[PDB]
Amino acid sequence: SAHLQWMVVRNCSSFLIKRNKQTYSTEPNNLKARNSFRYNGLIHRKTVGVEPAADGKGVVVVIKRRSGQRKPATSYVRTTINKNARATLSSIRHMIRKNKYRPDLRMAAIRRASAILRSQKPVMV
Template sequence: MNVNSFKYSGLANPKSVAITSAARGVRVVTQKKDKQSYPAKSANSTVIAKTRRATAKSVANLIAKSRYRPDLRAAAVARASAIISSQQPKKVHAKRESKGRRATKA
C-alpha cells in the first residue's frame, strides 16, 4: 500500500502480502510465518495472467478464502486492478480537425 502503518507493514507483521507487476499480469507474493528468518525460503510467489475480473477474483481467493490475511483483501484487489490498468496499451486518438471562423483565421 506504500502507507507507513502497522497494518500494512511487512516487517512488523509475520504474514504479509505483496502485489507487483509481472511481465504479463500480476505477481502475488505471500510470506510464510514459520520461515521468517530465512528470507530466500519465506516467500510463496504466484503469477496471475487473466482478465481483470478473473484476476480480481483469484487475488481475493488467494488472500481471503485461505484465511491468510482477510483484512488485506480489498487493498490487494485494488492494487491488482491498478497494475492491470497500467499494463493496458494507451489508446491513440486522432486529433480532431478545427472548425469555425477561428480555425480559418490561423
Template structure:
C-alpha cells in the same frame, strides 16, 4: 513480537519518505500495498504479508506472500504466484486466496485495488482521433 518490531522501526528506517506538510509518511518497502507507513500495511514486521507486483512480461500480476514458518530465513520466506488468466478471473482468484484461506483478510480490498491498478497500467493508451480540417470554400 511484530508490535515490538514496529515500535522500533516506525520513525526511522530506510524505506520512509518524509516530506513537509504531510502528516503521514510514505513507505517504499516491499509488500506494502498502499505505500503508507502504518503498522497494518507494513511488509517488514508481520509474519504474513501480501504484495502485488507487475510481471516482467507485462501480462497479469504476481502475488508475493510471506510464509509465516520461515520467519528466521528471509531468503526462503517469499512465495510468488503469477496470475495471468485475464483480469476478472485473476482478481477473483486473488480475492478467494486472501479471504477463503484466511490469509490477511484485512488486506483483501487493498490487494484488489493494487492488482486492478497494475492491470490498468498494462493496457495500451487509447489513440486519439485527429479531427478532419474544415475545407474553406
C-alpha cells in the same frame, strides 16, 4: 514481534519517505505504500504483496510462509496470475478470504492488482 518491530521502524526506516506533509513506505509487500503498522510488509508474520510481473502482463502475488520467518531466502512464495481482470481479481480474493490470510488486506490487494492491470493496458492519447 510485529508490535515491537513497529516501534523501532515507525519513524526510522530506510524505506520511510516524509515529504510534502505526506508519509510513504517504500518497502516491498506494502500495498498502499503507507507508513502504517497494518500495511507494513516486513514486520508481520503474514504479508500480501501484489506487484506487476517481470514481463508487462499479469500480476505476481507474494505470500509470506508462516514457517521460516528468520530465513529470508525461502520466506516468500511468488505466484504469477496472468489472465483476464475479473478472473485475476477473483483468484486474489480467494487467496485472501478463503485462506483467512490477512483478510484486512483483501480490498487493498484487489485494488492494487486492479491498478497494476489497468497500467498494463496500452495507453491511448
